[PDB]
Write a protein that binds this DNA or RNA. Structure first.
Lengths: 57, 57
DNA sequence: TCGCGCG
DNA sequence: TCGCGCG
C-alpha cells in the first residue's frame, strides 16, 4: 500500500516534504504519488502548505 | 512527420480545431500532439485562440 | 469553463 | 516561483 507508505514518510519527517523527496522514499513516480496525495488531501488527511510540498494533516 | 500532419489538418480545417479532433486526425495521443503544438506556437506557426484549441498562424 | 506542453 | 493530480 502506497497510501500507508506515504503517510509513514510524512509522519516520520514531521514537516513539509517535497514530491521529489517522496519519490526517493516511496520508489514510485511522481504522477503515481500525486494521484494518492491529492486524494488524501481531498480526504483532509494531508495538506499542501506549498506547491508540490506535503505534510501530515 | 507529425509536425506536417498537424499543419495539414489545421490548414485544411481553416478554423479552430480541438485537441480531441487532432487525435482522431493524427492518430497519436494528446500529450504527443501538445509537445509539437506548443513548440509550433512558440515559433509563431500556430495559435491557440482558446484553451486546447488550435488554428493556423 | 480541465488550461497540462513539464524537461 | 513549474503548480500537473486530469478521469
Amino acid at each position: 500500500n502506497l497510501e500507508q507508505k506515504i503517510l509513514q514518510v510524512l509522519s516520520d519527517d514531521g514537516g513539509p516534504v517535497k514530491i521529489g523527496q517522496l519519490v526517493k522514499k516511496c520508489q514510485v513516480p511522481k504522477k503515481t504519488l500525486n494521484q494518492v496525495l491529492y486524494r488524501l488531501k481531498k480526504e483532509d488527511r494531508v495538506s499542501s502548505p506549498e506547491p508540490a510540498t506535503w505534510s501530515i494533516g
